Every structure is written in C-alpha cells, then in structure tokens.
Amino acid sequence: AMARMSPADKRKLLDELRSIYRTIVLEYFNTDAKVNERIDEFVSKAFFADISVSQVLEIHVELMDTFSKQLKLEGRSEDILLDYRLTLIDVIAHLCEMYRRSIPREV
Amino acid sequence: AMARMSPADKRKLLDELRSIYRTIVLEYFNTDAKVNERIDEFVSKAFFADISVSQVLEIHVELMDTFSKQLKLEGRSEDILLDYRLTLIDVIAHLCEMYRRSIPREV
C-alpha cells in the first residue's frame, strides 16, 4: 500500500556499512578478530550496492566525527582517531583490490 | 650486454608517478590546470603497471614526507600538507573508479 522503496534502502544499506565499518575500526587493531569476514561484508556490500568510493568517504567523515565525540568522553587522545585515516584508506583500498580481481582482461 | 631490466623499470615507473603525483597535489587545488589529464596518466600508469594500492600509499608517505621538509622551509603551516590525505584518498579512489568501469559483468 505505502510501498516506500526509494533510495532509502541503499541508505539502510549504508547504515549497515556504518555499523560494519565501525566494527573494522573496532577490530582493525584486534588480535584474532575476523576483520576479513567483516571487511568482506563491507567490500561486498559496497560492491554489491554499486557504491561509489565517495560514499565510504562520507561514512568515514561521519564515523570519524562520531569517534571524535567518543574520544572526548574517553579522555584519551584523538591520536587514535587521528590514525584512523589509514583504516579509511585501507577499507576503500581493500574493496578496490576486489574490483581489480574482478577484471577478466577484456582486451 | 649488461641487460639490466629487473623490477627497476617498475621503480622508474613509480618515480614518474612520484613526479606526476606531485603535480596532482600541485595542481589539485589549481584553477584551470588539467589535473584530469595528469590524474589520467597516474590512474593509467598505476593500472598499466599492474600496481597495487599499497604502492601509491608509500609514494604518498614519501611525498607527504618530502612536502613536510618543504613546508618547513616555506615557514607555512603543514596544515596544507595535513590536508593532502584527501588527495591521497582521492588519487587511489580515482584509479579505483576506473577499475570499476573496467568490469564487464562476468556474471
């Protein structure tokens, strides 16, 4: 009746990436956490949801923004959050690595 | 006689990327500079030289390192160099965007 599809679905798709991504930064420096499986869902959803690199960039900005408010409460040193840039670059670099592997030389 | 091929060639290939990349950060915030043509050579060489994202990351580190010594002499505020992270993420994000376009749905 009120069929509300719209790009919102993709948004929800991003929301998950947000939580999933969050798990990466959370388990990125983990010891035995299966981030790969985590990164896979991210790399897969991004590739699955025909997502653009810019999208992840924003989720990063938003995430980095979120963690910013966190560190403040953690009375730590955004230094950790200041190093997350590597993760962001690593995340996109990861899914991108998958793009390359999906190239069957069209020649 | 002394045929010295070795991966050095790829290194030279990187050296160029270094200068080309350098032009990006130089013309990135340009006004009418044809960075696209510049970014194209980079995105093309990287894709051409079957280069990995990590490689560009290092060239970035090295470059960001180089510019670091520069700013010091420029008596400015590494702030500019501190914003180059966007370029690095943009550079790889650019070539990666090309990877995606090179995907003829294998399905």
Protein model, in words:
- Two copies of one chain form a homodimer.
- By secondary structure, chain A is mainly α.
- The first copy, chain A, has one domain (1-107): Methyltransferase, Methionine Synthase (B12-binding Domains), Chain A, domain 1.
- The first copy, chain A, contains five helices and no strands.
- In chain A, helix 1 (8-27) packs antiparallel against helix 2.
- The radius of gyration of chain A is 16 Å and the shape is globular.
- The termini of chain A are far apart.
- Chains A and B meet through helix 3 and helix 5 of A and helix 3 and helix 5 of B.
At a glance:
With 107 residues, chain A is an all-alpha fold.
List keywords for this structure.
homodimer, mainly alpha
Structural class of chain A: mainly alpha
Order of helices and strands of chain A: HHHHH
CATH architecture of chain A: Orthogonal Bundle
Query: What's the structural domain tally of chain A?
Result: 1
Q: Compute the CA-based radius of gyration of chain A.
A: 16 Å
State the CATH superfamily name of chain A.
Answer: KaiA/RbsU domain
Q: Please name the CATH topology of chain A.
A: Methyltransferase, Methionine Synthase (B12-binding Domains), Chain A, domain 1
Helix content of chain A: over 70%
Number of strands of chain A: 0
PDB class: circadian clock protein
Keywords: All alpha-helix protein, Homodimer, Circadian Clock Protein
Assembly: dimeric
Entry title: Solution Structure of the C-terminal Domain of Thermosynechococcus elongatus KaiA (ThKaiA180C); Averaged Minimized Structure
